[PDB]
Amino acid sequence: SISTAVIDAINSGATLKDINAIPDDMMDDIYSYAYDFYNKGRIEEAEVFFRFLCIYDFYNVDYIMGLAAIYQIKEQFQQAADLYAVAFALGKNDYTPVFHTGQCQLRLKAPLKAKECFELVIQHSNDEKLKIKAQSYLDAIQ
Amino acid sequence: GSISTAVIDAINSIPDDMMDDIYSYAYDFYNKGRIEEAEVFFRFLCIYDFYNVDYIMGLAAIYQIKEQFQQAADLYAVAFALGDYTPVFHTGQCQLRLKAPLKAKECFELVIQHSNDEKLKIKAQSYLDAI
Ligand SMILES: [Cl-]
Ligand SMILES: [Cl-]
Ligand SMILES: [Cl-]
Ligand SMILES: [Cl-]
Ligand SMILES: [Mg+2]
Ligand SMILES: [Mg+2]
Ligand SMILES: [Mg+2]
């Protein structure tokens, strides 16, 4: 993309994805590298790459979920919870981000918020495997 | 929008009574048919305090009125995730208008199965009867 196109996207609130600024295959490569860093415990680098990905397309559920995960690892629990809520909203009937928000709320010493998150999963998810995990946390809340 | 602002704010990183006042001013505009003014005030609220279900619901309503159904549905889902079933009911309406009737049906069924609002349940059933 030409500089005028990128500046227009910044000014108009458009994604860089919307103007095809980086080819699709290269973005897939970047996501794959981001995941490799993550799996290898290279958290700082993974964080750079997931921030890059979310700047490129701030509506991509998996890009957002990767950054949220990184923030949870780095104990930035409120920012992780904030991104998980967005990821839930942009996704397709997946309550896993809400489950992870429950974990974050426990770490923020907000157990009633946590309970509400795990209950949202238990009451509405069709994923019984995810429900088992959410129920495990709920059963441990005092 | 509100969502992209929330995501950008996370990448990079007024008292309650007065915020309540500004919400009421937004609703005052809305009730008088000043939808554009109402929208600005709700957008302001959702930039200042995005993770507030009442501000989200008000802005989503405006997008639905303006036939920006996907943006409305996205905001209704944030309101649902943050903690009644009115967001799910309105998401169902949005999905119908988006020509996604199986998505709509799932929303209305969720309302009927979980809501304690008997009037919302009747409304959801009337949509289900038509899908
Ligand atoms: Cl954790
Ligand atoms: Cl709490
Ligand atoms: Cl938005
Ligand atoms: Cl559908
Ligand atoms: Mg491709
Ligand atoms: Mg057991
Ligand atoms: Mg009522």
Swiss-Prot record, chain A:
Cell location: Cytoplasm
Assigned keywords, A-Z: Chaperone, Cytoplasm, Plasmid, Virulence
Residues annotated as signal peptide: none
The UniProt record lists the keyword Signal: no
Assigned protein family: Belongs to the LcrH/SycD chaperone family.
Listed GO CC annotations: cytoplasm
Claim: Membrane is one of the keywords in the record: no
SUPFAM superfamilies for the chain: TPR-like
Protein name: Chaperone protein IpgC
Molecular function in Gene Ontology: identical protein binding
NCBIfam families the UniProt entry points to: LcrH_SycD, PRK15331.1
Domain of life: Bacteria
Function per UniProt: Assists the correct folding of nascent IpaB. Once it is bound to IpaB, it binds to IpaC and impedes their premature association that would lead to their degradation in the absence of IpcG.
Curated annotation (Swiss-Prot), chain B:
Main subcellular localisation: cytoplasm
Pfam families, per database record: TPR_3
Residues annotated as transmembrane: none
MF annotations from Gene Ontology: identical protein binding
Keywords from the named record: Chaperone, Cytoplasm, Plasmid, Virulence
Gene3D superfamilies linked to this entry: Tetratricopeptide repeat domain
Record GO cellular component, one term: cytoplasm
Domain of life: Bacteria
Annotated family: Belongs to the LcrH/SycD chaperone family.
Entry protein name: Chaperone protein IpgC
Lineage of source species: Bacteria, Pseudomonadati, Pseudomonadota, Gammaproteobacteria, Enterobacterales
Gene coding for it: ipgC
